[PDB]
Amino acid sequence: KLPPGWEKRMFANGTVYYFNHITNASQFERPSG
Ligand SMILES: *[C@H]1O[C@@H](CO)[C@@H](O)[C@H](O)[C@H]1O
């Protein structure tokens, strides 16, 4: 689904984002869109 090292995440308010476990980077929008 996601590009290398990326996975789906979510804030405690119910808002969804993307996070990279290899580099600790994050985006609100889909990585390599
Ligand atoms: C959840 O709410 C968002 C919109 O206010 C943003 O502030 C953040 O992703 C979280 O705090």
PDB file of all heavy atoms in Angstrom:
ATOM      1  N   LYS A   1       0.838  -1.231   0.000  1.00  0.00           N
ATOM      2  CA  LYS A   1       0.000   0.000   0.000  1.00  0.00           C
ATOM      3  C   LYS A   1       0.863   1.268   0.000  1.00  0.00           C
ATOM      4  O   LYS A   1       0.991   1.908  -1.044  1.00  0.00           O
ATOM      5  CB  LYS A   1      -1.060  -0.026   1.127  1.00  0.00           C
ATOM      6  CG  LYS A   1      -1.986   1.205   1.176  1.00  0.00           C
ATOM      7  CD  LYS A   1      -2.837   1.399  -0.088  1.00  0.00           C
ATOM      8  CE  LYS A   1      -3.715   2.646   0.083  1.00  0.00           C
ATOM      9  NZ  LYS A   1      -4.592   2.859  -1.096  1.00  0.00           N
ATOM     10  N   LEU A   2       1.463   1.642   1.138  1.00  0.00           N
ATOM     11  CA  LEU A   2       2.341   2.816   1.256  1.00  0.00           C
ATOM     12  C   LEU A   2       3.754   2.559   0.671  1.00  0.00           C
ATOM     13  O   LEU A   2       4.172   1.397   0.582  1.00  0.00           O
ATOM     14  CB  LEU A   2       2.454   3.251   2.736  1.00  0.00           C
ATOM     15  CG  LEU A   2       1.226   3.848   3.450  1.00  0.00           C
ATOM     16  CD1 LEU A   2       0.374   4.742   2.550  1.00  0.00           C
ATOM     17  CD2 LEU A   2       0.352   2.781   4.101  1.00  0.00           C
ATOM     18  N   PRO A   3       4.509   3.615   0.301  1.00  0.00           N
ATOM     19  CA  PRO A   3       5.931   3.512  -0.058  1.00  0.00           C
ATOM     20  C   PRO A   3       6.810   3.056   1.134  1.00  0.00           C
ATOM     21  O   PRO A   3       6.343   3.051   2.279  1.00  0.00           O
ATOM     22  CB  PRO A   3       6.316   4.906  -0.577  1.00  0.00           C
ATOM     23  CG  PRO A   3       5.343   5.838   0.141  1.00  0.00           C
ATOM     24  CD  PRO A   3       4.072   5.004   0.226  1.00  0.00           C
ATOM     25  N   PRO A   4       8.086   2.672   0.909  1.00  0.00           N
ATOM     26  CA  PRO A   4       8.940   2.050   1.927  1.00  0.00           C
ATOM     27  C   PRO A   4       9.046   2.821   3.254  1.00  0.00           C
ATOM     28  O   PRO A   4       9.319   4.023   3.287  1.00  0.00           O
ATOM     29  CB  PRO A   4      10.306   1.865   1.264  1.00  0.00           C
ATOM     30  CG  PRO A   4       9.930   1.652  -0.201  1.00  0.00           C
ATOM     31  CD  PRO A   4       8.757   2.614  -0.386  1.00  0.00           C
ATOM     32  N   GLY A   5       8.839   2.103   4.362  1.00  0.00           N
ATOM     33  CA  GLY A   5       8.913   2.613   5.738  1.00  0.00           C
ATOM     34  C   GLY A   5       7.699   3.415   6.232  1.00  0.00           C
ATOM     35  O   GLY A   5       7.649   3.737   7.418  1.00  0.00           O
ATOM     36  N   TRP A   6       6.718   3.729   5.377  1.00  0.00           N
ATOM     37  CA  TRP A   6       5.505   4.483   5.738  1.00  0.00           C
ATOM     38  C   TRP A   6       4.346   3.585   6.205  1.00  0.00           C
ATOM     39  O   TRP A   6       4.146   2.482   5.694  1.00  0.00           O
ATOM     40  CB  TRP A   6       5.070   5.354   4.555  1.00  0.00           C
ATOM     41  CG  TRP A   6       5.933   6.545   4.267  1.00  0.00           C
ATOM     42  CD1 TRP A   6       6.982   6.564   3.416  1.00  0.00           C
ATOM     43  CD2 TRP A   6       5.841   7.896   4.815  1.00  0.00           C
ATOM     44  NE1 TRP A   6       7.534   7.831   3.384  1.00  0.00           N
ATOM     45  CE2 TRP A   6       6.865   8.696   4.224  1.00  0.00           C
ATOM     46  CE3 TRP A   6       4.984   8.532   5.738  1.00  0.00           C
ATOM     47  CZ2 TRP A   6       7.040  10.051   4.538  1.00  0.00           C
ATOM     48  CZ3 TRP A   6       5.141   9.897   6.051  1.00  0.00           C
ATOM     49  CH2 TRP A   6       6.168  10.654   5.460  1.00  0.00           C
ATOM     50  N   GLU A   7       3.549   4.086   7.152  1.00  0.00           N
ATOM     51  CA  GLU A   7       2.343   3.437   7.689  1.00  0.00           C
ATOM     52  C   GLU A   7       1.306   4.481   8.166  1.00  0.00           C
ATOM     53  O   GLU A   7       1.666   5.604   8.535  1.00  0.00           O
ATOM     54  CB  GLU A   7       2.768   2.479   8.821  1.00  0.00           C
ATOM     55  CG  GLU A   7       1.644   1.552   9.304  1.00  0.00           C
ATOM     56  CD  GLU A   7       2.178   0.401  10.185  1.00  0.00           C
ATOM     57  OE1 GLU A   7       2.967   0.657  11.131  1.00  0.00           O
ATOM     58  OE2 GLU A   7       1.788  -0.774   9.960  1.00  0.00           O
ATOM     59  N   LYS A   8       0.011   4.129   8.175  1.00  0.00           N
ATOM     60  CA  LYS A   8      -1.075   4.984   8.686  1.00  0.00           C
ATOM     61  C   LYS A   8      -1.033   5.131  10.211  1.00  0.00           C
ATOM     62  O   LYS A   8      -0.698   4.188  10.933  1.00  0.00           O
ATOM     63  CB  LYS A   8      -2.448   4.463   8.230  1.00  0.00           C
ATOM     64  CG  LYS A   8      -2.718   4.853   6.772  1.00  0.00           C
ATOM     65  CD  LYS A   8      -4.022   4.266   6.212  1.00  0.00           C
ATOM     66  CE  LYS A   8      -5.257   4.863   6.901  1.00  0.00           C
ATOM     67  NZ  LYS A   8      -6.516   4.326   6.323  1.00  0.00           N
ATOM     68  N   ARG A   9      -1.411   6.325  10.668  1.00  0.00           N
ATOM     69  CA  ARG A   9      -1.456   6.831  12.056  1.00  0.00           C
ATOM     70  C   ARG A   9      -2.721   7.673  12.292  1.00  0.00           C
ATOM     71  O   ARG A   9      -3.436   8.017  11.348  1.00  0.00           O
ATOM     72  CB  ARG A   9      -0.187   7.679  12.320  1.00  0.00           C
ATOM     73  CG  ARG A   9       0.866   7.045  13.241  1.00  0.00           C
ATOM     74  CD  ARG A   9       1.289   5.668  12.728  1.00  0.00           C
ATOM     75  NE  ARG A   9       2.492   5.132  13.384  1.00  0.00           N
ATOM     76  CZ  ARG A   9       2.964   3.916  13.171  1.00  0.00           C
ATOM     77  NH1 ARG A   9       2.339   3.079  12.393  1.00  0.00           N
ATOM     78  NH2 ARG A   9       4.069   3.516  13.729  1.00  0.00           N
ATOM     79  N   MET A  10      -2.992   8.037  13.547  1.00  0.00           N
ATOM     80  CA  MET A  10      -4.156   8.855  13.922  1.00  0.00           C
ATOM     81  C   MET A  10      -3.922   9.630  15.232  1.00  0.00           C
ATOM     82  O   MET A  10      -3.356   9.097  16.190  1.00  0.00           O
ATOM     83  CB  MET A  10      -5.398   7.950  14.039  1.00  0.00           C
ATOM     84  CG  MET A  10      -6.713   8.739  14.073  1.00  0.00           C
ATOM     85  SD  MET A  10      -8.199   7.748  14.388  1.00  0.00           S
ATOM     86  CE  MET A  10      -8.005   7.434  16.166  1.00  0.00           C
ATOM     87  N   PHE A  11      -4.371  10.886  15.274  1.00  0.00           N
ATOM     88  CA  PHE A  11      -4.398  11.734  16.471  1.00  0.00           C
ATOM     89  C   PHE A  11      -5.536  11.337  17.429  1.00  0.00           C
ATOM     90  O   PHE A  11      -6.560  10.790  17.012  1.00  0.00           O
ATOM     91  CB  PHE A  11      -4.545  13.207  16.049  1.00  0.00           C
ATOM     92  CG  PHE A  11      -3.354  13.792  15.311  1.00  0.00           C
ATOM     93  CD1 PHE A  11      -3.382  13.945  13.911  1.00  0.00           C
ATOM     94  CD2 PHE A  11      -2.227  14.226  16.033  1.00  0.00           C
ATOM     95  CE1 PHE A  11      -2.287  14.519  13.238  1.00  0.00           C
ATOM     96  CE2 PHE A  11      -1.134  14.801  15.361  1.00  0.00           C
ATOM     97  CZ  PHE A  11      -1.162  14.947  13.963  1.00  0.00           C
ATOM     98  N   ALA A  12      -5.406  11.687  18.714  1.00  0.00           N
ATOM     99  CA  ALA A  12      -6.408  11.401  19.751  1.00  0.00           C
ATOM    100  C   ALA A  12      -7.779  12.081  19.516  1.00  0.00           C
ATOM    101  O   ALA A  12      -8.789  11.655  20.079  1.00  0.00           O
ATOM    102  CB  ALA A  12      -5.809  11.804  21.106  1.00  0.00           C
ATOM    103  N   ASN A  13      -7.830  13.109  18.658  1.00  0.00           N
ATOM    104  CA  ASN A  13      -9.059  13.784  18.218  1.00  0.00           C
ATOM    105  C   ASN A  13      -9.807  13.057  17.068  1.00  0.00           C
ATOM    106  O   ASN A  13     -10.875  13.512  16.650  1.00  0.00           O
ATOM    107  CB  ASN A  13      -8.722  15.253  17.877  1.00  0.00           C
ATOM    108  CG  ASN A  13      -7.792  15.435  16.683  1.00  0.00           C
ATOM    109  OD1 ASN A  13      -7.730  14.592  15.792  1.00  0.00           O
ATOM    110  ND2 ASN A  13      -7.047  16.527  16.663  1.00  0.00           N
ATOM    111  N   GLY A  14      -9.264  11.947  16.547  1.00  0.00           N
ATOM    112  CA  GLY A  14      -9.846  11.165  15.448  1.00  0.00           C
ATOM    113  C   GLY A  14      -9.396  11.570  14.032  1.00  0.00           C
ATOM    114  O   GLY A  14     -10.016  11.139  13.058  1.00  0.00           O
ATOM    115  N   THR A  15      -8.330  12.368  13.891  1.00  0.00           N
ATOM    116  CA  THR A  15      -7.800  12.817  12.585  1.00  0.00           C
ATOM    117  C   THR A  15      -6.670  11.894  12.120  1.00  0.00           C
ATOM    118  O   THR A  15      -5.753  11.603  12.888  1.00  0.00           O
ATOM    119  CB  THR A  15      -7.293  14.270  12.648  1.00  0.00           C
ATOM    120  OG1 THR A  15      -8.310  15.120  13.132  1.00  0.00           O
ATOM    121  CG2 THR A  15      -6.852  14.821  11.292  1.00  0.00           C
ATOM    122  N   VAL A  16      -6.708  11.442  10.864  1.00  0.00           N
ATOM    123  CA  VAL A  16      -5.790  10.428  10.308  1.00  0.00           C
ATOM    124  C   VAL A  16      -4.605  11.091   9.596  1.00  0.00           C
ATOM    125  O   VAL A  16      -4.762  12.118   8.932  1.00  0.00           O
ATOM    126  CB  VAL A  16      -6.568   9.468   9.383  1.00  0.00           C
ATOM    127  CG1 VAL A  16      -5.682   8.501   8.590  1.00  0.00           C
ATOM    128  CG2 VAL A  16      -7.555   8.621  10.200  1.00  0.00           C
ATOM    129  N   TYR A  17      -3.416  10.497   9.733  1.00  0.00           N
ATOM    130  CA  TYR A  17      -2.173  10.926   9.083  1.00  0.00           C
ATOM    131  C   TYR A  17      -1.279   9.722   8.721  1.00  0.00           C
ATOM    132  O   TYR A  17      -1.639   8.566   8.952  1.00  0.00           O
ATOM    133  CB  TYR A  17      -1.460  11.967   9.972  1.00  0.00           C
ATOM    134  CG  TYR A  17      -0.821  11.486  11.267  1.00  0.00           C
ATOM    135  CD1 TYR A  17       0.564  11.218  11.320  1.00  0.00           C
ATOM    136  CD2 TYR A  17      -1.587  11.420  12.447  1.00  0.00           C
ATOM    137  CE1 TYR A  17       1.180  10.896  12.544  1.00  0.00           C
ATOM    138  CE2 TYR A  17      -0.968  11.135  13.681  1.00  0.00           C
ATOM    139  CZ  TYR A  17       0.420  10.877  13.733  1.00  0.00           C
ATOM    140  OH  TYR A  17       1.022  10.584  14.916  1.00  0.00           O
ATOM    141  N   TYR A  18      -0.113   9.985   8.133  1.00  0.00           N
ATOM    142  CA  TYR A  18       0.888   8.997   7.725  1.00  0.00           C
ATOM    143  C   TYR A  18       2.224   9.276   8.422  1.00  0.00           C
ATOM    144  O   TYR A  18       2.630  10.433   8.558  1.00  0.00           O
ATOM    145  CB  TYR A  18       1.044   9.015   6.196  1.00  0.00           C
ATOM    146  CG  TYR A  18      -0.257   8.813   5.439  1.00  0.00           C
ATOM    147  CD1 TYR A  18      -1.039   9.926   5.069  1.00  0.00           C
ATOM    148  CD2 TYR A  18      -0.699   7.512   5.132  1.00  0.00           C
ATOM    149  CE1 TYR A  18      -2.271   9.741   4.413  1.00  0.00           C
ATOM    150  CE2 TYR A  18      -1.926   7.325   4.467  1.00  0.00           C
ATOM    151  CZ  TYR A  18      -2.720   8.437   4.115  1.00  0.00           C
ATOM    152  OH  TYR A  18      -3.912   8.245   3.489  1.00  0.00           O
ATOM    153  N   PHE A  19       2.920   8.225   8.851  1.00  0.00           N
ATOM    154  CA  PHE A  19       4.186   8.300   9.584  1.00  0.00           C
ATOM    155  C   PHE A  19       5.199   7.279   9.053  1.00  0.00           C
ATOM    156  O   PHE A  19       4.841   6.144   8.731  1.00  0.00           O
ATOM    157  CB  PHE A  19       3.905   8.126  11.084  1.00  0.00           C
ATOM    158  CG  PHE A  19       5.127   7.904  11.955  1.00  0.00           C
ATOM    159  CD1 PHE A  19       5.836   9.004  12.473  1.00  0.00           C
ATOM    160  CD2 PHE A  19       5.555   6.595  12.259  1.00  0.00           C
ATOM    161  CE1 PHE A  19       6.959   8.800  13.296  1.00  0.00           C
ATOM    162  CE2 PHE A  19       6.669   6.392  13.090  1.00  0.00           C
ATOM    163  CZ  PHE A  19       7.375   7.493  13.607  1.00  0.00           C
ATOM    164  N   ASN A  20       6.466   7.681   8.958  1.00  0.00           N
ATOM    165  CA  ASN A  20       7.571   6.848   8.498  1.00  0.00           C
ATOM    166  C   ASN A  20       8.401   6.335   9.685  1.00  0.00           C
ATOM    167  O   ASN A  20       9.068   7.118  10.364  1.00  0.00           O
ATOM    168  CB  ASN A  20       8.403   7.655   7.494  1.00  0.00           C
ATOM    169  CG  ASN A  20       9.466   6.797   6.845  1.00  0.00           C
ATOM    170  OD1 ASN A  20      10.508   6.538   7.427  1.00  0.00           O
ATOM    171  ND2 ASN A  20       9.254   6.331   5.638  1.00  0.00           N
ATOM    172  N   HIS A  21       8.401   5.023   9.930  1.00  0.00           N
ATOM    173  CA  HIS A  21       9.046   4.433  11.116  1.00  0.00           C
ATOM    174  C   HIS A  21      10.578   4.322  11.004  1.00  0.00           C
ATOM    175  O   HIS A  21      11.266   4.185  12.017  1.00  0.00           O
ATOM    176  CB  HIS A  21       8.371   3.095  11.468  1.00  0.00           C
ATOM    177  CG  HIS A  21       8.940   1.878  10.772  1.00  0.00           C
ATOM    178  ND1 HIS A  21       9.965   1.068  11.274  1.00  0.00           N
ATOM    179  CD2 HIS A  21       8.543   1.379   9.565  1.00  0.00           C
ATOM    180  CE1 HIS A  21      10.151   0.097  10.364  1.00  0.00           C
ATOM    181  NE2 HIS A  21       9.314   0.261   9.327  1.00  0.00           N
ATOM    182  N   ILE A  22      11.118   4.440   9.785  1.00  0.00           N
ATOM    183  CA  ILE A  22      12.559   4.391   9.490  1.00  0.00           C
ATOM    184  C   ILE A  22      13.239   5.742   9.774  1.00  0.00           C
ATOM    185  O   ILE A  22      14.367   5.780  10.273  1.00  0.00           O
ATOM    186  CB  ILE A  22      12.767   3.935   8.022  1.00  0.00           C
ATOM    187  CG1 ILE A  22      12.112   2.567   7.709  1.00  0.00           C
ATOM    188  CG2 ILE A  22      14.256   3.927   7.630  1.00  0.00           C
ATOM    189  CD1 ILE A  22      12.712   1.362   8.447  1.00  0.00           C
ATOM    190  N   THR A  23      12.552   6.853   9.480  1.00  0.00           N
ATOM    191  CA  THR A  23      13.099   8.229   9.511  1.00  0.00           C
ATOM    192  C   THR A  23      12.411   9.168  10.515  1.00  0.00           C
ATOM    193  O   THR A  23      12.869  10.295  10.716  1.00  0.00           O
ATOM    194  CB  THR A  23      13.046   8.871   8.114  1.00  0.00           C
ATOM    195  OG1 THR A  23      11.708   9.011   7.692  1.00  0.00           O
ATOM    196  CG2 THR A  23      13.788   8.067   7.046  1.00  0.00           C
ATOM    197  N   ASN A  24      11.320   8.725  11.153  1.00  0.00           N
ATOM    198  CA  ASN A  24      10.430   9.511  12.024  1.00  0.00           C
ATOM    199  C   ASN A  24       9.727  10.713  11.343  1.00  0.00           C
ATOM    200  O   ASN A  24       9.209  11.598  12.030  1.00  0.00           O
ATOM    201  CB  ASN A  24      11.123   9.850  13.361  1.00  0.00           C
ATOM    202  CG  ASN A  24      11.733   8.634  14.040  1.00  0.00           C
ATOM    203  OD1 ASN A  24      11.045   7.709  14.448  1.00  0.00           O
ATOM    204  ND2 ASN A  24      13.039   8.593  14.189  1.00  0.00           N
ATOM    205  N   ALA A  25       9.683  10.753  10.006  1.00  0.00           N
ATOM    206  CA  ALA A  25       8.929  11.749   9.238  1.00  0.00           C
ATOM    207  C   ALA A  25       7.404  11.519   9.317  1.00  0.00           C
ATOM    208  O   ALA A  25       6.945  10.413   9.616  1.00  0.00           O
ATOM    209  CB  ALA A  25       9.434  11.739   7.788  1.00  0.00           C
ATOM    210  N   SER A  26       6.602  12.552   9.030  1.00  0.00           N
ATOM    211  CA  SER A  26       5.131  12.467   8.985  1.00  0.00           C
ATOM    212  C   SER A  26       4.501  13.435   7.975  1.00  0.00           C
ATOM    213  O   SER A  26       5.041  14.509   7.693  1.00  0.00           O
ATOM    214  CB  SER A  26       4.508  12.666  10.376  1.00  0.00           C
ATOM    215  OG  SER A  26       4.842  13.925  10.935  1.00  0.00           O
ATOM    216  N   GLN A  27       3.349  13.041   7.423  1.00  0.00           N
ATOM    217  CA  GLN A  27       2.497  13.851   6.544  1.00  0.00           C
ATOM    218  C   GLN A  27       1.013  13.640   6.858  1.00  0.00           C
ATOM    219  O   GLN A  27       0.588  12.526   7.157  1.00  0.00           O
ATOM    220  CB  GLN A  27       2.702  13.465   5.068  1.00  0.00           C
ATOM    221  CG  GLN A  27       3.975  14.038   4.440  1.00  0.00           C
ATOM    222  CD  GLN A  27       4.122  13.755   2.938  1.00  0.00           C
ATOM    223  OE1 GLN A  27       5.149  14.046   2.338  1.00  0.00           O
ATOM    224  NE2 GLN A  27       3.140  13.201   2.252  1.00  0.00           N
ATOM    225  N   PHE A  28       0.197  14.685   6.711  1.00  0.00           N
ATOM    226  CA  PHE A  28      -1.262  14.567   6.760  1.00  0.00           C
ATOM    227  C   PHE A  28      -1.817  13.930   5.466  1.00  0.00           C
ATOM    228  O   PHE A  28      -2.835  13.236   5.495  1.00  0.00           O
ATOM    229  CB  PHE A  28      -1.841  15.964   7.016  1.00  0.00           C
ATOM    230  CG  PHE A  28      -3.336  16.058   6.801  1.00  0.00           C
ATOM    231  CD1 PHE A  28      -4.228  15.596   7.786  1.00  0.00           C
ATOM    232  CD2 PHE A  28      -3.830  16.558   5.582  1.00  0.00           C
ATOM    233  CE1 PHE A  28      -5.616  15.650   7.555  1.00  0.00           C
ATOM    234  CE2 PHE A  28      -5.215  16.602   5.348  1.00  0.00           C
ATOM    235  CZ  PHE A  28      -6.109  16.153   6.338  1.00  0.00           C
ATOM    236  N   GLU A  29      -1.127  14.129   4.336  1.00  0.00           N
ATOM    237  CA  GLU A  29      -1.504  13.615   3.009  1.00  0.00           C
ATOM    238  C   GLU A  29      -0.637  12.416   2.574  1.00  0.00           C
ATOM    239  O   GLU A  29       0.498  12.249   3.036  1.00  0.00           O
ATOM    240  CB  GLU A  29      -1.503  14.764   1.984  1.00  0.00           C
ATOM    241  CG  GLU A  29      -0.103  15.333   1.688  1.00  0.00           C
ATOM    242  CD  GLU A  29      -0.155  16.598   0.800  1.00  0.00           C
ATOM    243  OE1 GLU A  29      -0.997  16.683  -0.131  1.00  0.00           O
ATOM    244  OE2 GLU A  29       0.670  17.523   1.013  1.00  0.00           O
ATOM    245  N   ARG A  30      -1.175  11.575   1.681  1.00  0.00           N
ATOM    246  CA  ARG A  30      -0.609  10.266   1.296  1.00  0.00           C
ATOM    247  C   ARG A  30       0.834  10.404   0.759  1.00  0.00           C
ATOM    248  O   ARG A  30       1.036  11.130  -0.220  1.00  0.00           O
ATOM    249  CB  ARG A  30      -1.561   9.599   0.276  1.00  0.00           C
ATOM    250  CG  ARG A  30      -1.698   8.069   0.374  1.00  0.00           C
ATOM    251  CD  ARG A  30      -0.457   7.224   0.050  1.00  0.00           C
ATOM    252  NE  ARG A  30       0.114   7.476  -1.285  1.00  0.00           N
ATOM    253  CZ  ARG A  30      -0.331   7.033  -2.448  1.00  0.00           C
ATOM    254  NH1 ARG A  30      -1.454   6.382  -2.563  1.00  0.00           N
ATOM    255  NH2 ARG A  30       0.347   7.224  -3.542  1.00  0.00           N
ATOM    256  N   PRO A  31       1.846   9.738   1.356  1.00  0.00           N
ATOM    257  CA  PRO A  31       3.242   9.822   0.913  1.00  0.00           C
ATOM    258  C   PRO A  31       3.433   9.248  -0.499  1.00  0.00           C
ATOM    259  O   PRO A  31       2.794   8.263  -0.869  1.00  0.00           O
ATOM    260  CB  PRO A  31       4.062   9.073   1.972  1.00  0.00           C
ATOM    261  CG  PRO A  31       3.048   8.102   2.573  1.00  0.00           C
ATOM    262  CD  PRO A  31       1.766   8.923   2.559  1.00  0.00           C
ATOM    263  N   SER A  32       4.306   9.872  -1.298  1.00  0.00           N
ATOM    264  CA  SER A  32       4.460   9.594  -2.743  1.00  0.00           C
ATOM    265  C   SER A  32       3.115   9.592  -3.499  1.00  0.00           C
ATOM    266  O   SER A  32       2.788   8.647  -4.223  1.00  0.00           O
ATOM    267  CB  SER A  32       5.281   8.318  -2.990  1.00  0.00           C
ATOM    268  OG  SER A  32       6.564   8.424  -2.388  1.00  0.00           O
ATOM    269  N   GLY A  33       2.296  10.628  -3.275  1.00  0.00           N
ATOM    270  CA  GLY A  33       0.979  10.837  -3.906  1.00  0.00           C
ATOM    271  C   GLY A  33       1.050  11.077  -5.418  1.00  0.00           C
ATOM    272  O   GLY A  33       0.313  10.395  -6.164  1.00  0.00           O
TER     273      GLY A  33
HETATM  274  C1  LIG B   1      -6.299  16.957  15.500  1.00  0.00           C
HETATM  275  O1  LIG B   1      -7.032  18.149  15.054  1.00  0.00           O
HETATM  276  C2  LIG B   1      -6.471  18.811  13.837  1.00  0.00           C
HETATM  277  C3  LIG B   1      -7.373  19.985  13.386  1.00  0.00           C
HETATM  278  O2  LIG B   1      -7.444  21.040  14.378  1.00  0.00           O
HETATM  279  C4  LIG B   1      -4.980  19.194  14.071  1.00  0.00           C
HETATM  280  O3  LIG B   1      -4.855  20.261  15.066  1.00  0.00           O
HETATM  281  C5  LIG B   1      -4.164  17.959  14.542  1.00  0.00           C
HETATM  282  O4  LIG B   1      -4.087  17.005  13.441  1.00  0.00           O
HETATM  283  C6  LIG B   1      -4.794  17.284  15.787  1.00  0.00           C
HETATM  284  O5  LIG B   1      -4.619  18.170  16.947  1.00  0.00           O
END
